[PDB]
Amino acid sequence: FFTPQVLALEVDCNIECASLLDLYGQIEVSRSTF
């Protein structure tokens, strides 16, 4: 009989670490074994 007020927050509490992927040299590649 009592409908709770569904509030609109969503706690996450989950860290990533650190993308160290912009320092490295990137090269678009093609069919494998370059």
């Binding site: 912009d22 990137q26 090269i27």
Partner: protein, 52 residues
């Protein structure tokens, strides 16, 4: 639809916006750079999601 174009892997990352979503003038003309991406149609539609 498409909104922006990526040109390059690492150094070139200029996400040039499409003509669809771009800062337009009061008349409708854009003000910033954009790209076109003209496409040749095919079977089963898929205006941009089809095979060449």
């Amino acid at each position: 639809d498409v909104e922006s174009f990526q040109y390059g892997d690492e150094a070139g990352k200029e996400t040039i916006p499409s003509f669809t979503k771009v800062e337009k003038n009061d008349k409708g003309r854009p003000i910033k750079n954009y790209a076109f991406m003209i496409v040749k149609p095919s079977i089963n539609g898929a205006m941009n999601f089809d095979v060449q």
